[PDB]
């Protein structure tokens, strides 16, 4: 049986829970859930109503256009996802006035053996539900969507690479280095020598500078954030030498 | 019949393209897709292999970890969504390398009738193909997925939001204000009399200055990339004097 000890339990609060599948059943997340590392379990709103129509959305005070989800189907699925999970999941909403995510922020969630995420559906939820039920409100960009089930499976796909047992140069801060594979000739284009060359210390050193020299042309400012090291710096200096010659 | 004529006609590369029911069988896309405003169509480089095995893989010059997605069945799925698109139609790549997507970047890419994107899989793809196939690299943010489908939905979800008949704070670069519906109570809890009031000027303002004063206490860069209107700059003043006093 596979080792599963860092395993990690999300619960999921959504009308849709069958958009779920496309990562529970799919490629290399649908093999941790196959395997137990990963669990995702999803409660509906839906299943909490008791009028006969299902009725899960309702008109926001002050008016204006839209609808917010409805507070007591929503808040009830949430509970029954709390007591579910049991001590020490924290419950998290998405939307894009949270915390922005980025690969440092993935790392934080990851420590988390258990969260529940709260998907938002038509104009949101319920000031006073965040006020009352939600730990942490966060952002998976600057961009609005119609649902929070994308965002909450781009968090799950994010935080399960960190699961020991999920996976067979984000790393240090970097944008990766180009990737080459057969044939060695593409319309016109050849693989770069070094890499054909055996030499893995050589290798190791032009895939270095590719990233020092692909953020500073793309992503500058995230050079900012960093304290490279004295061959990080070096070669920095000679990408953007040759850039310049 | 429903008018389409801002439709949208989006192609996919897809290894998994069975995800993408996600958004085109429920909520909001899956109505735009019903109703034809959103046509999602999707190849499988599984599709154009030939040997026994399928193969879709294949392992990296210079060696290391990891393998990339296979140049031939992936050109090949690529050039059949070129075609079948015909004229007109821009190629995106999906990766943490590429243009960071906020809401501006999704109303430029909404501009186009035609897309196609290729979701990379394994570490990615070969760099030759991103020369010689793709026109623009965009990321939905910084951070590291394990495939390129979930990025692809929601760029799709965030422009479907563009096309006329999708829809029943962002849209001046600020946050959104609190929301609320029924109870007028929750938990202790009471909704701004303001939203009661039926004033619709009175609650405009506050929802405009909860939005500045809520960009301002969470993402204060954002408002350096606005010309307040002069009742914007009061309402902010406002909100400010009172968080100090
Ligand atoms: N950028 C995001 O992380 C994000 C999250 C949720 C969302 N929409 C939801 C929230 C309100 C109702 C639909 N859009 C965008
Ligand atoms: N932040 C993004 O937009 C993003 C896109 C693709 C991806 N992973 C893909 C690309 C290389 C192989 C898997 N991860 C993240």
Redesign the pocket.
Known sequence: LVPRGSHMWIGVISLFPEMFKAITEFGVTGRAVKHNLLKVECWNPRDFTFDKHKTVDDRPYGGGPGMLMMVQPLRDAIHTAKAAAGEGAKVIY???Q?RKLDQGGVTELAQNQKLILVC?????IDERLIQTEIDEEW???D??????EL?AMTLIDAVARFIPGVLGSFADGLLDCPHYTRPEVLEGLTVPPVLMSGHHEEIRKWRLKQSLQRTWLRRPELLEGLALTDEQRKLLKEAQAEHNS
Do not use: A, C, F, Q
């Open positions: 998405l939307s894009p949270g938002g559906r038509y104009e949101g952002s998976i960009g961009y609005v969507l119609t649902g929070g965002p």
